[PDB]
Each structure stands twice: as structure tokens, then as C-alpha cells.
Amino acid sequence: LVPSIHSIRSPVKICSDGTHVAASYETGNICIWNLTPALPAVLHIDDHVNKEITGLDFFGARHTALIVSDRTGKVSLYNGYQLVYNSKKILDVNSSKEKLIRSKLSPLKISTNLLSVLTTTHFALILLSHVSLMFQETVEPSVQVNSSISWTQNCSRVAYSVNNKISVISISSSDFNVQSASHSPEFAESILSQ
């Protein structure tokens, strides 16, 4: 993934269908390759360039739509119109001492659209599948970066560990209802990372 081709000078920074490859350029750019000749480029994205890139991942079967997370753009809506991905901002949460740490494709009947926003002042999750909020818990405002968040493959619970602290909230997949939550005790050492 790069025959008159050359390696990409940009350093490396969730297509469930397995038909494309996404490369995260270190300059806030994203490259798409059609997935021993290299895979030809399919698209280039520079919206996240000159800005923080919290995370990104393909929208499952909706390969045309691309989910991209930024500490400034925050909630958006991207659709693939060889479909060019055009995105319109939905809501920005860069202010009020809130910054998006990371976000990618959710766990994978209810469509997978519950997206979590890891904000330092208060973490939350908006359950888009009108669009509502899955939950909102006031996180420690010290950050406002040993923070990470993931969702179980069963889509029944999602954990999040920040510094020497952790908390797991269990939410139903098909019903899209938060079953319960529990904040784990503070660890003796900072959590570097399932």
C-alpha cells in the first residue's frame, strides 16, 4: 500500500467489510487504498490536517461514510456521495474546558451509532441510535495523557481507563439502553493502556 509508485513520506499516525485500507498520515491526513504491486490510492483527506486527530474509523458496512474524531470538530456527520466523503459539523465540544481524547468505530437490533466523547472535564457518550445521549459522567478535570476507551465485542459494556483510574459502563446493544455503570478503584500506577 503506497509499478511507478513510491513509499509515502508521511509517517503513520475499521473497514469491517474488508474492502479498503486506511492509513493515518502524521500530518493530520488520511489515505485510502483499494484493499506484489502496492494498493492504489483511493482517497485523500486533509480536514484533520492542521488540527488534532483524536481518532477515526470506517463506518462498518457503510464504507462510503467515514467517521473521524477531532478535539475541535467533535460531533459531525460524514456521508459518501468512488464516493467522496463530505462531512458537515454537527456539534463542537472543544470549549468549556472539554477536549476529545479519542474515538473510533463502536462495538460491532440497533444500528451501531452510539459514539463516546472522552472529555477531560466530563466524559460522555451520545447514543445516535432522534439522536440522544447514552450517558454523561463528570470525569476528573486534571487533564482539562494516559487515557483510553474501548467497547466489548459483545457490545454490552464499554470500559475507559484514564491515568491511574478506570470505569466501565454496561449498555444494552439491541435496546441501546445503559444497563448500569461502575467506577473502578484508583490504580496504584497509571494505566498505560483491553
- Measured over all CA atoms, what is the biggest interatomic distance in the chain, rounded to whole angstroms? 56
- Kindly state the cell numbers that stand for 114: 452510539
CB-neighbour burial class of residue 79 (10 A; exposed 0-12, middle 13-18, buried 19+): middle
Rounded CA-CA distance 96/72 in Å is 12
| In the block, residue with C-alpha cell 467515514 | 66
- The CA R_g of the chain, rounded to the nearest whole Å, is 18
DSSP conformational letter for 35: -
Sheet holding 123-127, edge to edge: 114-117, 123-127, 135-137
Per the listing, cell 451501531 goes with 112
Of 72, 77, 67, give the one whose Cα is nearest residue 45.
67
Q: After what residue numbers is the chain broken, C–N > 2.5 angstroms?
A: 2, 13, 35, 81, 108, 129, 144, 193
Q: Name every residue whose Cβ is closer than 8 Å to that of residue 20 and which is 6 or more positions away in sequence.
A: 32, 33, 34, 35, 42, 58, 63
As a whole number of angstroms, the distance between CA 147 and CA 149 comes to 7
Please state the length of the chain: 194
The alpha carbon of residue 20 and the mean position of all alpha carbons in its chain are separated, in whole angstroms, by 18
The tally of CA atoms less than 13 A away on the side-chain side of residue 187 is 13
Q: Can you tell me whether residue 57 is helix, strand or coil?
A: strand
Q: How was this structure determined?
A: cryo-EM
Resolution in units of Å: 4.6
Report the candidate in 34, 29, 26, 28 with the shortest Cα–Cα distance to residue 2: 34
Alpha carbon distance 59, 15 (integer Å): 7
Grid coordinates in use for 89?
459539523
CA angle 106, 111, 115 (to 5 degrees): 35
How far is 53 from 45, CA to CA, in rounded Å? 12
